[PDB]
Write an enzyme that holds these catalytic residues in place. Structure first.
Site, PDB file in Angstrom:
ATOM      1  N   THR A  44       1.161  -1.309  -0.454  1.00 48.40           N
ATOM      2  CA  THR A  44      -0.067   0.409  -0.084  1.00 48.40           C
ATOM      3  C   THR A  44       0.763   1.096  -0.189  1.00 48.40           C
ATOM      4  O   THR A  44       1.647   1.624   0.250  1.00 48.40           O
ATOM      5  CB  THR A  44      -0.893   0.243   1.051  1.00 48.40           C
ATOM      6  OG1 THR A  44      -2.108  -0.760   0.854  1.00 48.40           O
ATOM      7  CG2 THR A  44      -1.351   1.522   1.593  1.00 48.40           C
ATOM      8  N   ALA A  90      -8.288  -2.980   6.686  1.00 50.02           N
ATOM      9  CA  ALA A  90      -9.032  -2.571   6.228  1.00 50.02           C
ATOM     10  C   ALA A  90     -10.554  -2.404   6.388  1.00 50.02           C
ATOM     11  O   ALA A  90     -11.137  -1.396   6.611  1.00 50.02           O
ATOM     12  CB  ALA A  90      -9.515  -2.758   4.163  1.00 50.02           C
TER      13      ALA A  90
END
EC number: 3.4.25.1
Lengths: 239, 232, 201, 212, 233, 212, 229, 247, 234
Positions: free
Chosen positions: C1, C49
Site C-alpha cells: 500500500t 481495511a
C-alpha cells in the site's frame, strides 16, 4: 384502617387481606375430589357463560407431572401461575434426585410458596385454592388441599367452591373406603348434578379425570363413553 | 434506593414543585446584567454586610472559565453544586476538542441538568436562577438567563430576584444605543438601574466587569464609590 | 500500500494506489483507499481495511451529530482528536490502522496523521504504507511550497508511480484528490501501466 | 480443542445488464473423507437477492439463520422489504460485531438494484466489502480468477471488440470454468447449482460433475 | 394520594389526562401537507422588547429531510429531539440509507408511557412528557406530516394545528384546505389563519416558517424573504 | 469438556422404506482399557425419535437428561402438537454451537433417526456444530471402514427393505469388530417404524472366520 | 425489599419524639446501678423472675465482651442481645488488626456509632435500651453509659431503670472517692434495696465486678455472703 | 410504601424547606459557643452543659475535637451527628495530605464538609444533620481564619461570631466592642470572658461552666492548647476587678 | 373509598377495582369482530372517525406469517405487546426451525400479563386483543383480557356497543363452518354494520379486513382493496 395491607394485624389478631382473598374463592363454582382404594377421581362443574365459546375453554384440570393431577377454584390467572410453579418444582426435583417427587413433598413446597405472599406490603395473597392427587404403588392414592393462606391437609374427599356446605354434607354419606373408581365416578357425577343450581346458572359443563392403577399411575381424563354413561346414571338417580 | 415521584402533574397541568422553586428564587438579592459594545458587566445587591463578615467568602459572582462568568439568585448551597459541575464540564470540553467553550454550550449544559432534576425519581428541583455572560473567539459578547425549569433565552439586559419587577421597567425605558457607547457610560447605567431598588442608599452593591482583556476584573469599593458621586 | 499527502499554497493533495493482497496472491486490483467522510473531510486507508472502514464510518456519524447539535461544522483538529480517542480504548487488542485527515477550516489547510498506537501529529508532508520510503525520496526532492496545482499533480503522480514500480504490494491505478476552500474534487484515476509508457519512451 | 474446521467448496458470482448469477458445488468435506454429496451453499434471501457462503459449515448455518431473522425484523418495522445495498451494509456490521472470535466465512451477495441491474458484493471474514462485477471465493478461487479476468474483463487480449455478456454466454462460461476447476482441485466436483436472479424471479438449474 | 400509574372509574390514567391539559397553555403551531412539500409555522409569543427574538427556536431540524415543530414544555421536548436525531443517524450508519418519517414518529412515540417509580430502570422518568410534536418530510413516497401526543398515539395528517387556539384554527383549516393546493397558497393561508388567531400583530420577527420539498433540503425562511412574503400578502 | 475420559466408538445408521435402523456396540473404553462392558449408547426420545452418541459418556448422559425433560414437559399439557425428528435435530445443533462458542464444548457425535408424517429422517450433529442429512451415516472409525460398503450398496439400489438393511448393518458391524481396536463383540440394534421404536438386546457377530 | 425513608424526623420545635419515646421505654425497665471504686467497678441488677416455674440459671443480664469488659442494661432484652453480639464482633476485629485488647473508650465509641446509625436510616426504629459499660486498662477502672440516641457519658456512680431519680439522689450522699471495692459493693446493694418491694435473695439479683484480673460475675454462693451483711 | 412516607426533601407552598427550618430551631436551644479572631491567633470558648457532680472529666475537652495539626472546631446541636461529622472531617484532611503531601487549607475543608451536608437536603429520603460548627485554623495563604456552617449547607468567614443560645444578643454586644485590626489575644480573652459572663443566665461564671481553647504560631509550628482552670479563674478574677472598679 | 387505588388491595367482597377500571378502559374503543370457518379465519375492524383531516389508524397488525391480531384500548400498550409476540415467534423459528402454535403463544401472553396485577406500584395492561391464526389443527380465534385470563371462541366481538354484534353472531353461528370465504367475510361485515348508529353505513375507508387460512398467509386489505367485499351488502 387495618384492611389495606398484609403486614397489619387487627387489634384482635386477624389479617383481613387473606380473609378477603378467601371470599374471592368462597363465591366461585364448585369442584370436588374423592379418594378411593385404587385411585382418585376429580370432578368440576364447568360453567358455560355464552354459546360463543368453544367447549374446552377455561379448563380447571391440569397435569403438573406425569402422575399428579390438579383441580382449581378462584382466579384462573393466579391458578395458572401456581400450576407453572408446581411444574417447575417437580422438574427440578427429578433433575436433582433422579426419580419422581412425592405428593407430600410437592404440596409442602407449593404451600410454602403460597404462604410467602401473606407477610409483605409489596405483594398480595393469591385468590385461588386447589386440590392435588396421585397414585403410587408405594403409598397408594393421595389427596391434598391448599388454601389462600397456605395451609395444606390430607383428606378423603374435598369440596372447594361455593357449594362446599351442601357438597360436603352429601359426600360424607358415601363409604368411599371400599368403593372403586369405576364405582366412584358415577357418584361424583351424581353429587355434582345434585349440588348444581339450575336457576341462577342455566347451563353447565362436566369434565372428569382420574389417576389410579387402571391408568398405571398416569393422570388422565375420563374417556367419553364412561362420561356419557355417568351422566345418564346421574340423571336417572336425580328424578 | 429511593424511587418516588416528587414532582408530578396536577389538575390544570401545573408542576407545583417547580412553581414553588420559582417562588423561592423570587426571594433572593437582586442581580442585574447588561451587554456592552466591548465590555460586559454584572451587579449584585448586598442585603446587609453586618460589619463583621469577610466579603471575600460571600461573593455571588464566580468565574467558570477564562471568558465565562455567572451570577445567581436563590440558594447558595445549590448554586455551588451547579457551578462546580459547570467547571468540570468546561475542562472536559477543552480537553476533548482543544478549544474554549461557547457561552451557549455551557448554558445548554446547565439547563439540561436543571431539567433532568424535574423528571427523575427521588429528587427535588434546584432553587436558583443564573445569568451567564462572556465573550467568544469571534469577539461577540453574550448574555443569557436560565430558570429552575430548564428554559433559557438570550437578552439585551435583564434582572432577577426581588425588585426585578421594577428594575425591568426602568431598564426597558432607559436602554438605548446611546448609554452603550462607553464603559463609564454603561457602568453608570447599571448603577442607577440598581440604586432605585436598593432602598438603603449608598453602595451596598458588588459590581464585576469583564472585557476582552483582564478578565473578570472586579471593581474596588473605592472605585465603585466614585461613580455614585458622579451620578449625583 | 502507498498513500501520500502534502499541503502547499493551494490546499492539500492526496494520492493512493488500489491493489489489495492476501499473502502473495493479488485478491483485488482496484480498491478505494480514500474514504470520503463528508463533503468537507476525507481520510485514508492503510493497515486493516475493516478497521479503517469501520472507525471512519463511526467518525462520520459523530461529525454529523456535532454539526446538528452546535449549528456549526467541526474542525480538523477536533476530528483527529475524536478518532484518536475512539481507538485508544482498544490499545493492545490487535487493531491495525494509520490514517491521514485533511481538510480546510478557519485556520487554513489541515493535515494530520493518526495511528493505532494513539499518536497524532501535524505536518506538511506525510506518507504511509510499505512504499512510503520510496515515495519519500521523490516527495522530498521535488517538493516546494511555492508550487501551483498542476506541478503538485505531476509530483504526486510521479511519486506513486515509482513507488509501485519498486514495491511488490503496490500497483494498479492511482487516484488523486484535491482539497480546496469549497470542498474537495476528484482529479484523475490514471493507471500505472498507462503512466509508465508516458514516463519513458 | 480447535473451534474451526475446513470444509472446502467454491462459489462464483457474475453480474450482467439484466441478470445476476451465483453458482456453487455440492460437496461437503473434512480432512480426507467426504461427508455428503448433496449440500448447497446458495440461499435465497428475498425475491431478488441470493447469498453464497464458504468456509466453516457451523458458522455458515448460524449466519444464514441470523440474516433471515433480521430481514423479517426490518420488514415488520419499516413496512417494506430490504434492498441489496442495505443487506450488504448490515452484513458488514454483523461480521464486524464478531471481530475477536470471528465467523470464518467468505460471503458473496448477489441481486438486482432499484434501477434493475446486477450487483455483486464481495466480503471478507471481518467485514470489508466492495461492489464488483464478478468474484470467486473458496478453494479454487486462485484457479478461477485469471480465467474470468481473460473472459469477462477481456484483459490481456487486443484485436477484439468487447460486447456485453448475454445470459447464454455467461452460463456457458460458468459451466466450463467449473468443469476445469473440478479436474484439478480435490475439493470440488459432485454437482453444480446455478441460481439466476432476474426481473421475473429466481430460477435454478443443476448439472452433474465427475465423482471422486 | 395516588401513584403515577392509576386508572380512573373510566380507565383514563389521571397523569396522562393532566399532561394533555398541559398543552392548552402553549403557543399555536400549524402544519400543512401539499403535493409539492410541507410547511410548518409557529407563533413566537415575545414577552418584552428586551428579549432577543432570534433566541426562540421552536422549529428544529431532525435531518436533511425531516423537521419538527413543538408546543408545550420546550424544556421537555429537547430529549425527544436528541433521541430522534440519534436514531436517524444510527439508521444511516447501519443500512446506508435514510430513515422514513413513519419510522421516526413511531420510534419517538415509544418513549411515551415509559415512566414509573418502582422496578423501572436505574435512571427513569417520573412523569409523562408535556410536548406535542409535528413531523414533516419527504421520503420514497412523498411529503408526509404526522402528529404525536403525550399518550403515545401518532397519526398521519395533511393539515393539523396544535396549541391553545386549535379548536378555532381547525375550524378554518377544514374550510381552507383542499386536495388541489399548491405550497404557495398553503403558505398564504397558513399565514392568514395565524394573523386571524394571534393576539399581537403578525410581523416579520414574531413568527417562524420552514419548508421541505422533493427537490431541496430542510430550509428556514429568512428575515429578507419572510418580510417580502408578508409585505406581498 | 476439556478432556474426555470414558468414550464410545462408531455408531451406524441406515434408512429404508418405512423406517430407520441404527446400531452401536456396548463398551466404555478408558483409554485402551475395556473398563465397562455392558452400557447402552442408544436412547429413545419419543414414539418416533431415536438417538445414538459417540465420545464422552458423561456428556451423553447429561444430554439424555435434558432432552428427556423437554419431551416430558411438552407432553404434559397434551395439546395435540409433539416434537419431531427435525425439531430435535435443530435444537441439538443450536445447543452444540452455543457450547463451542464459549470454548466449553460437549464432546459427542450424535445421530438422530426418526419416522414421522410418512417418511424417514436421518441426521448428523458434530461437536463443533456441523450438521447435515444423508441416507447413511457412520461416526468415528466407521466413517472410514463402514461408509464405503453402505455407499457401494446404495449406489446400485437406492431403496432397501427392512431385512436387507438389517443384514447390511450386521455385515458392517462384523468388519468393525475385525479392524477396530476399541470395538467389542456385543451390540444393540434399534428400529423406528410406524408402530414406534424397538430395541434389541445383546447381539453377537459370532459369524467370525479366523483362518490363520 | 425495605423502606428507604426515615421514620425519625424533626418536629416544629426541633425534637425527635421517636428517640424521646425510646427513652420512655427505657424508663420502664428494671433498676441497674454502677459504682466506680478506687480499684474496681461494680454492676448490680434486679433479676426478678415472674414465677417459680422459670429456670433462673438459663438467662443472664450481666455479660462479658472481652477478658476485661462487661456490661448490663435496662430496657428491652431482645435488643440487648443484638447489641451484645455486635460489641463482641467489634472487639474481635480490633484485636485482629492491632494484636492488642481494645480499650473501653474505643469500644463505647463504636457501639454508640451503631446505635446512632439506627436513628437516621430507612425503615427502622431506634433501640429501646441503655447500656452500662465497665472496663479496666492501663491501671485504671472506667465506667460509661450509652443512650438510645448515641450519646455516651462517663460517671463515678449512676443508676438506670425505674426509680433512677431517687437512686442517684441517694447515691450522691454516701459516695466517697477513697472507697474500696468491697465496701462499694455494700452501697450498690443498699441502693438496690431502697426500691425492691420484696425480700432480697441470691437469685433476685445479679452482680459483676472488674478489677486488675478481669471481669467476672459473682456466684450465688458469694452473693449469699455479701447479702448476709 | 407511600402511606408511611414523610417526604423530608420537598418544597413548601412558599419555597421553604421545613425539615431544615426545624433543625435550625433545634440548634437554637443548645449550649453557647463563641469565637473571636485576632492579630496573633484565634480562640474558641464554649459553655459546659453537663455540670452534674458525679461525672468524669477523662477527656481533655468536651466540645473541641482537634481535626488536624492546624485546625479545630466546636459544635452545637446533636452530639450523635457531631461525632459522624468529626470523623468525616478527619478522613477528608488525611486524604488531601495523601494526595498532595501538604496540609489542607481551611476553606477547602469547610467546603468539602458542606457538600456532604447539602447532599442530605436534596435526595435520599433521610433527615438532615442538626448541627452547626465553628472552625479555626492557619494556612499558608490567609493565616488565621474563623468560619461557620449550618444545617442547610452554607458557610461564611467572620471575625467574631456566636452560635447556640442567646447568640442574637451575643452578636449584638460583639458588634459594639470589636475593633478591626487592633485587637490582641489578651483583649480578645477579656472580651470573650465579659460576653460569656452576660449571655449566660447564671449569676456569674464558675471557671468550670466554661471551656477555652486558643491557637497560635510559634517557631514555625502551630500550637492548639486548651486553657486550664486556674488560668480561667485568673481571667475571671481580672474581669471581676476592673468591672467592679468602674462602678 | 380506600380500596380503589392500588392493584394489591382486596375489597371486602374479594374484588380488585383497579383491574375492573382497566377493563372499563377497554370498552371505550371501537368495535371489532372475528370468526372462523372450516379452513379460514377472519378479522374485521371499524377504524374510528378521528377528525375531518387525519388518516384513521392502524388496528390490525402482522405478528407472523400465520398470526395476526386486532386491538382495542391503549395503543402504546398494544404495540408493546405486539413486539413481545413478534420476538416470541422469531425465537421459536430460530431454535426449532418451525412455526409456533397459537395456543402456546396465548399461554405466554397470559403468563406475562398476569405478573403486573400482583405487585406494588404497577398497573395492568389496558388493552384487549383478538388473535387469529392457522396451524396443523386449523384456525383459532382466541381472545384476551386485561385480567390475564383468555378464552377460545368460534366468534367474538370486543369494543363499545358490541352487545348487538354478539347477539347477531350467536344467532347466525349455525352456518359459519360450512360457509365459503366470501360468505364468511360478509357475515363479518354485516355483524360489524350492526354496531354503527343509524346515520352511518360502511363506506370504503373506515373498515379493515384480515385473512389467514390453509394455503394463504396473513394479509391486510387496504382502503380500496376492500372494494370486492362491500359490493353486495344491500
Amino acid at each position: 384502617g387495618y384492611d389495606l395491607s398484609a403486614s397489619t394485624f387487627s387489634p384482635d389478631g386477624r389479617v383481613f387481606q387473606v380473609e378477603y382473598a378467601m371470599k374471592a374463592v368462597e363465591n366461585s363454582s364448585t369442584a370436588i375430589g374423592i379418594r378411593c382404594k385404587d385411585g382418585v377421581v376429580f370432578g368440576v362443574e364447568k360453567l358455560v357463560l355464552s354459546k360463543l365459546y368453544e367447549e374446552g375453554s377455561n379448563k380447571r384440570l391440569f397435569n403438573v407431572d406425569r402422575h399428579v393431577g390438579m383441580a382449581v377454584a378462584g382466579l384462573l390467572a393466579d391458578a395458572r401461575s401456581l400450576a407453572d410453579i408446581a411444574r417447575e418444582e417437580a422438574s427440578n426435583f427429578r433433575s436433582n434426585f433422579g426419580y419422581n417427587i412425592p405428593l407430600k413433598h410437592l404440596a409442602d413446597r407449593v404451600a410454602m410458596y403460597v404462604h410467602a405472599y401473606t407477610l409483605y406490603s409489596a405483594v398480595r395473597p393469591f385468590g385461588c385454592s386447589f386440590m392435588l392427587g396421585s397414585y403410587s404403588v408405594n403409598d397408594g392414592a393421595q389427596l391434598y388441599m391448599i388454601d389462600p393462606s397456605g395451609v395444606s391437609y390430607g383428606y378423603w374427599g374435598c369440596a372447594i367452591g361455593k357449594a362446599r356446605q351442601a357438597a360436603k354434607t352429601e359426600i360424607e354419606k358415601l363409604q368411599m373406603k371400599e368403593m372403586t373408581c369405576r364405582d366412584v365416578v358415577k357418584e361424583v357425577a351424581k353429587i355434582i348434578y345434585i349440588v348444581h343450581d339450575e336457576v341462577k346458572d342455566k347451563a353447565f359443563e362436566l369434565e372428569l379425570s382420574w389417576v389410579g392403577e387402571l391408568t398405571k399411575g398416569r393422570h388422565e381424563i375420563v374417556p367419553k363413553d364412561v362420561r356419557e354413561e355417568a351422566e345418564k346414571y346421574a340423571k336417572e338417580s336425580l328424578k | 434506593s429511593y424511587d418516588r415521584a416528587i414532582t408530578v402533574f396536577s389538575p390544570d397541568g401545573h408542576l407545583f414543585q417547580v412553581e414553588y422553586a420559582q417562588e423561592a428564587v423570587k426571594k433572593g438579592s437582586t442581580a442585574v446584567g447588561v451587554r456592552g459594545r466591548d465590555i460586559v458587566v454584572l451587579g449584585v445587591e448586598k442585603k446587609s454586610v453586618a460589619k463583621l463578615q469577610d466579603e471575600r467568602t460571600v461573593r455571588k459572582i464566580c468565574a467558570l472559565d477564562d471568558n465565562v462568568c455567572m451570577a445567581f439568585a436563590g440558594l447558595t448551597a445549590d448554586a455551588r453544586i451547579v457551578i462546580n459541575r459547570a467547571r468540570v464540564e468546561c475542562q472536559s470540553h477543552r480537553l476533548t476538542v482543544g478549544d474554549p467553550v461557547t457561552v451557549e454550550y455551557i448554558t445548554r449544559y446547565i439547563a439540561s441538568l436543571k431539567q433532568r432534576y424535574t423528571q427523575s425519581n427521588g429528587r427535588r428541583p434546584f432553587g436558583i436562577s443564573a445569568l451567564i455572560v462572556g465573550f467568544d473567539f469571534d469577539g461577540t459578547p453574550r448574555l443569557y438567563q436560565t430558570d429552575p425549569s430548564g428554559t433559557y433565552h438570550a437578552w439585551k439586559a435583564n434582572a432577577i430576584g426581588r425588585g426585578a419587577k421594577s428594575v425591568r421597567e426602568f431598564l426597558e425605558k432607559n436602554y438605548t444605543d446611546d448609554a452603550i457607547e462607553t464603559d463609564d457610560l454603561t457602568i453608570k447605567l447599571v448603577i442607577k438601574a440598581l440604586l432605585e431598588v436598593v432602598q438603603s442608599g449608598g453602595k451596598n452593591i458588588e459590581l464585576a466587569v469583564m472585557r476582552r482583556d483582564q478578565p473578570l476584573k472586579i471593581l474596588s469599593p473605592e472605585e465603585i464609590e466614585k461613580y455614585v458621586a458622579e451620578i449625583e | 500500500t502507498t498513500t501520500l499527502a502534502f499541503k502547499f499554497q493551494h490546499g492539500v493533495i492526496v494520492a493512493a494506489d488500489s491493489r489489495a493482497t492476501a499473502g502473495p496472491y493479488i485478491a483485488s486490483q482496484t480498491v478505494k483507499k480514500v474514504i470520503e467522510i463528508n463533503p468537507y473531510l476525507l481520510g485514508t486507508m492503510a493497515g486493516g481495511a475493516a478497521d479503517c472502514s469501520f472507525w471512519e464510518r463511526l467518525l462520520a456519524r459523530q461529525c454529523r451529530i456535532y454539526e446538528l447539535r452546535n449549528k456549526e461544522r467541526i474542525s480538523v483538529a477536533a476530528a483527529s482528536k475524536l478518532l484518536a480517542n475512539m481507538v485508544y480504548q482498544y490499545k493492545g487488542m490487535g487493531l491495525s490502522m494509520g490514517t491521514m485527515i485533511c481538510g480546510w477550516d478557519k485556520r487554513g489547510p489541515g493535515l494530520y496523521y493518526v495511528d493505532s498506537e494513539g499518536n497524532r501529529i501535524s505536518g506538511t508532508a506525510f506518507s504511509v504504507g510499505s512504499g512510503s520510503v520510496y515515495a519519500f525520496g521523490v516527495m522530498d526532492r521535488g517538493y516546494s511550497y511555492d508550487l501551483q496545482v498542476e506541478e503538485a499533480y505531476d509530483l504526486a503522480r510521479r511519486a506513486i508511480y515509482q513507488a509501485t514500480y519498486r514495491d511488490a504490494y503496490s500497483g494498479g491505478a492511482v487516484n488523486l484528490y484535491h482539497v480546496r476552500e469549497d470542498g474537495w474534487i476528484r482529479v484523475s484515476s490514471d493507471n500505472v501501466a498507462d503512466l509508465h509508457d508516458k514516463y519513458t519512451s | 480443542f480447535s473451534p474451526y474446521a475446513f470444509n472446502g467448496g467454491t462459489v462464483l458470482a457474475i453480474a450482467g445488464e439484466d441478470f445476476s448469477i451465483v453458482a456453487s458445488d455440492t460437496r461437503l468435506s473434512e480432512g480426507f473423507s467426504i461427508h455428503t454429496r448433496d449440500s448447497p451453499k446458495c440461499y435465497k434471501l428475498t425475491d431478488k437477492t441470493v447469498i453464497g457462503c464458504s468456509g466453516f459449515h457451523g458458522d455458515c448455518l448460524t449466519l444464514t439463520k441470523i440474516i433471515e431473522a433480521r430481514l423479517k425484523m426490518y420488514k415488520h418495522s419499516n413496512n417494506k422489504a430490504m434492498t441489496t445495498g442495505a443487506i450488504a451494509a448490515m452484513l458488514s456490521t454483523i461480521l464486524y460485531s464478531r471481530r475477536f472470535f470471528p465467523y470464518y466465512v467468505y460471503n458473496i451477495i448477489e441481486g438486482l438494484d432499484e434501477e434493475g441491474k446486477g450487483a455483486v458484493y464481495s466480503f471478507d471474514p471481518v467485514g470489508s466489502y466492495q461492489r464488483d462485477s464478478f468474484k470467486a471465493g473458496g478453494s479454487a478461487s486462485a484457479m478461477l480468477q485469471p480465467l474470468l479476468d481473460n473472459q469477462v474483463g477481456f484483459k490481456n487480449m487486443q484485436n477484439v471488440e468487447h460486447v456485453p455478456l448475454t445470459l447464454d454466454r455467461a452460463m456457458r462460461l460458468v459451466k466450463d470454468v467449473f468443469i476445469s476447476a473440478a479436474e484439478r482441485d480435490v475439493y470440488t466436483g459432485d454437482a453444480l447449482r446455478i441460481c439466476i436472479v432476474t426481473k421475473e424471479g429466481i430460477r435454478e438449474e443443476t448439472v452433474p460433475l465427475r465423482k471422486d | 394520594d395516588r401513584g403515577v400509574n392509576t386508572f380512573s372509574p373510566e380507565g383514563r390514567l389521571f397523569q396522562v389526562e393532566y399532561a394533555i391539559e398541559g398543552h392548552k397553555l402553549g403557543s399555536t403551531a400549524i402544519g400543512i401537507q401539499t403535493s409539492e412539500g410541507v410547511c410548518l409555522a409557529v407563533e413566537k409569543r415575545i414577552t418584552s422588547p428586551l428579549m432577543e427574538p432570534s433566541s426562540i427556536e421552536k422549529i428544529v431540524e431532525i435531518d436533511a429531510h425531516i423537521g419538527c415543530a413543538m408546543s408545550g414544555l420546550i424544556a421537555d421536548a429537547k430529549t425527544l429531539i436528541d433521541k430522534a436525531r440519534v436514531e436517524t443517524q444510527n439508521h444511516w450508519f447501519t443500512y446506508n440509507e435514510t430513515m422514513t418519517v413513519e419510522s421516526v414518529t413511531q420510534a419517538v412515540s415509544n418513549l411515551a408511557l415509559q415512566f414509573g417509580e418502582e422496578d423501572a430502570d436505574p435512571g427513569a422518568m417520573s412523569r409523562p412528557f408535556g410536548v406535542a410534536l409535528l413531523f414533516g418530510g419527504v421520503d420514497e413516497k412523498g411529503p408526509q406530516l404526522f402528529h404525536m401526543d403525550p399518550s403515545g398515539t401518532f397519526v398521519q395528517c395533511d393539515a393539523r394545528a396544535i396549541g391553545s387556539a386549535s379548536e378555532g384554527a381547525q375550524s378554518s383549516l377544514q374550510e381552507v384546505y383542499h386536495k388541489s393546493t399548491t405550497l404557495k397558497e398553503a403558505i398564504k393561508s397558513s399565514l392568514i389563519i395565524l394573523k386571524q388567531v394571534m393576539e399581537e400583530k403578525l410581523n416579520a420577527t414574531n413568527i417562524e416558517l420552514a419548508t421541505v420539498q422533493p427537490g431541496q433540503n430542510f430550509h428556514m425562511f429568512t428575515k429578507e424573504e419572510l418580510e417580502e412574503v408578508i409585505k406581498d400578502i | 469438556t476439556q478432556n474426555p475420559m470414558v468414550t464410545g466408538t462408531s455408531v451406524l445408521g441406515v434408512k429404508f422404506d418405512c423406517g430407520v435402523v441404527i446400531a452401536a456396540d456396548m463398551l466404555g473404553s478408558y483409554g485402551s482399557l475395556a473398563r465397562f462392558r455392558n452400557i447402552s449408547r442408544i436412547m429413545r426420545v419419543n414414539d418416533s425419535t431415536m438417538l445414538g452418541a459417540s465420545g464422552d459418556y458423561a456428556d451423553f448422559q447429561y444430554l439424555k437428561q435434558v432432552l428427556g425433560q423437554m419431551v416430558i414437559d411438552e407432553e404434559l399439557f397434551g395439546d395435540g402438537h409433539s416434537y419431531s425428528p427435525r425439531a430435535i435435530h435443530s435444537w441439538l445443533t443450536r445447543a452444540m454451537y452455543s457450547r463451542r462458542s464459549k470454548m466449553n464444548p460437549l464432546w459427542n457425535t450424535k445421530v438422530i433417526g426418526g419416522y414421522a408424517g410418512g417418511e424417514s429422517f436421518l441426521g448428523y450433529v458434530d461437536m463443533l456444530g456441523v450438521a447435515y442429512e444423508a441416507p447413511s451415516l457412520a461416526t468415528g472409525y466407521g466413517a472410514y471402514l463402514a461408509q464405503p460398503l453402505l455407499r457401494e450398496v446404495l449406489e446400485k439400489q437406492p431403496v432397501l427393505s427392512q431385512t436387507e438393511a438389517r443384514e447390511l448393518v450386521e455385515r458392517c458391524m462384523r468388519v468393525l469388530y475385525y479392524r477396530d481396536a476399541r470395538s467389542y463383540n456385543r451390540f444393540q440394534v434399534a428400529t423406528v417404524t410406524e408402530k414406534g421404536v424397538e430395541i434389541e438386546g445383546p447381539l453377537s457377530a459370532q459369524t467370525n472366520w479366523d483362518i490363520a | 425489599r425495605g423502606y428507604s425513608f426515615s421514620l425519625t424526623t424533626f418536629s416544629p420545635s426541633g425534637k425527635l419524639v421517636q428517640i424521646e419515646y425510646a427513652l420512655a421505654a427505657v424508663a420502664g425497665g428494671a433498676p441497674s446501678v454502677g459504682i466506680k471504686a478506687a480499684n474496681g467497678v461494680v454492676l448490680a441488677t434486679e433479676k426478678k423472675q415472674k414465677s417459680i416455674l422459670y429456670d433462673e440459671r438459663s438467662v443472664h443480664k450481666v455479660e462479658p465482651i472481652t477478658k476485661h469488659i462487661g456490661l448490663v442494661y435496662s430496657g428491652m432484652g431482645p435488643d440487648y442481645r443484638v447489641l451484645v453480639h455486635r460489641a463482641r464482633k467489634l472487639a474481635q476485629q480490633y484485636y485482629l488488626v492491632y494484636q492488642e485488647p481494645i480499650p473501653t473508650a474505643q469500644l463505647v465509641q463504636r457501639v454508640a456509632s451503631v446505635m446512632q446509625e439506627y436513628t437516621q436510616s430507612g425503615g427502622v426504629r431506634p433501640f429501646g435500651v441503655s447500656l452500662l459499660i465497665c472496663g479496666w486498662n492501663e491501671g485504671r477502672p472506667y465506667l460509661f453509659q450509652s443512650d438510645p440516641s448515641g450519646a455516651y457519658f462517663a460517671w463515678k456512680a449512676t443508676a438506670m431503670g425505674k426509680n433512677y431519680v431517687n437512686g442517684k439522689t441517694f447515691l450522691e450522699k454516701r459516695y466517697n472517692e477513697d472507697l474500696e471495692l468491697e465496701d462499694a459493693i455494700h452501697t450498690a446493694i443498699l441502693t438496690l434495696k431502697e426500691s425492691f418491694e420484696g425480700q432480697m435473695t441470691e437469685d433476685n439479683i445479679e452482680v459483676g465486678i472488674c478489677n486488675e484480673a478481669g471481669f467476672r460475675r459473682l456466684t450465688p454462693t458469694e452473693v449469699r455472703d455479701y447479702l448476709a451483711a | 410504601s407511600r402511606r408511611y412516607d414523610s417526604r423530608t426533601t420537598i418544597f413548601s407552598p412558599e419555597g421553604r424547606l421545613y425539615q431544615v427550618e426545624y433543625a435550625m430551631e433545634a440548634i437554637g436551644h443548645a449550649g453557647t459557643c463563641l469565637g473571636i479572631l485576632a492579630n496573633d491567633g484565634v480562640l474558641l470558648a464554649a459553655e459546659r452543659r453537663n455540670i452534674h457532680k458525679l461525672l468524669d472529666e477523662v477527656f481533655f475537652s468536651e466540645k473541641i475535637y482537634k481535626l488536624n495539626e492546624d485546625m479545630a472546631c466546636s459544635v452545637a446541636g446533636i452530639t450523635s451527628d457531631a461525632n459522624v461529622l468529626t470523623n468525616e472531617l478527619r478522613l477528608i484532611a488525611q486524604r488531601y495530605l495523601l494526595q498532595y503531601q501538604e496540609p489542607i487549607p481551611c476553606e477547602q475543608l469547610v467546603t468539602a464538609l458542606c457538600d456532604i451536608k447539602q447532599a442530605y437536603t436534596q435526595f435520599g429520603g433521610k433527615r438532615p444533620f442538626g448541627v452547626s460548627l465553628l472552625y479555626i485554623g492557619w494556612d499558608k495563604h490567609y493565616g488565621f481564619q474563623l468560619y461557620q456552617s449550618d444545617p442547610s449547607g452554607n458557610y461564611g468567614g467572620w471575625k467574631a461570631t456566636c452560635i447556640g443560645n442567646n447568640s442574637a444578643a451575643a452578636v449584638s454586644m460583639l458588634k459594639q466592642d470589636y475593633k478591626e485590626g487592633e485587637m490582641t489575644l489578651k483583649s480578645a480573652l477579656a472580651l470573650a470572658v465579659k460576653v460569656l459572663n452576660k449571655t449566660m443566665d447564671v449569676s456569674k461564671l464558675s471557671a468550670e461552666k466554661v471551656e477555652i481553647a486558643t491557637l497560635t504560631r510559634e517557631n514555625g509550628k502551630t500550637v492548639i492548647r486548651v486553657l486550664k482552670q486556674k488560668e480561667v479563674e485568673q481571667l475571671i478574677k481580672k474581669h471581676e476587678e476592673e468591672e467592679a472598679k468602674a462602678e | 373509598n380506600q380500596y380503589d387505588n392500588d392493584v394489591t388491595v382486596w375489597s371486602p367482597q374479594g374484588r380488585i377495582h383497579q383491574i375492573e377500571y382497566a377493563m372499563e378502559a377497554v370498552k371505550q374503543g371501537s368495535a371489532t369482530v372475528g370468526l372462523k370457518s372450516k379452513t379460514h379465519a377472519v378479522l374485521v375492524a371499524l377504524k374510528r372517525a378521528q377528525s375531518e383531516l387525519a388518516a384513521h389508524q392502524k388496528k390490525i397488525l402482522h405478528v407472523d406469517n400465520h398470526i395476526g391480531i386486532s386491538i382495542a384500548g391503549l395503543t402504546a400498550d398494544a404495540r408493546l405487546l405486539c413486539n413481545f409476540m413478534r420476538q416470541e415467534c422469531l425465537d421459536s423459528r430460530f431454535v426449532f426451525d418451525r412455526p409456533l402454535p397459537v395456543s402456546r403463544l396465548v399461554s405466554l401472553i397470559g403468563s406475562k400479563t398476569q405478573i403486573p396485577t400482583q405487585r406494588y406500584g404497577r398497573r395492568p395492561y389496558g388493552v384487549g386483543l383478538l388473535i387469529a391464526g392457522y396451524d396443523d389443527m386449523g384456525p383459532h380465534v382466541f381472545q384476551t383480557c386485561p385480567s390475564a385470563n383468555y378464552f377460545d371462541c368460534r366468534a367474538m366481538s370486543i369494543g363499545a356497543r358490541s352487545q348487538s354484534a354478539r347477539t347477531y353472531l350467536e344467532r347466525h353461528m349455525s352456518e359459519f363452518m360450512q360457509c365459503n370465504l366470501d360468505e364468511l367475510v360478509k357475515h363479518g361485515l354485516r355483524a360489524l354494520r350492526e354496531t354503527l348508529p343509524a346515520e352511518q353505513d360502511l363506506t370504503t375507508k373506515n373498515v379493515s379486513i384480515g385473512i389467514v387460512g390453509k394455503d394463504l398467509e396473513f394479509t391486510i386489505y387496504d382502503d380500496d382493496d376492500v372494494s370486492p367485499f362491500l359490493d353486495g351488502l344491500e
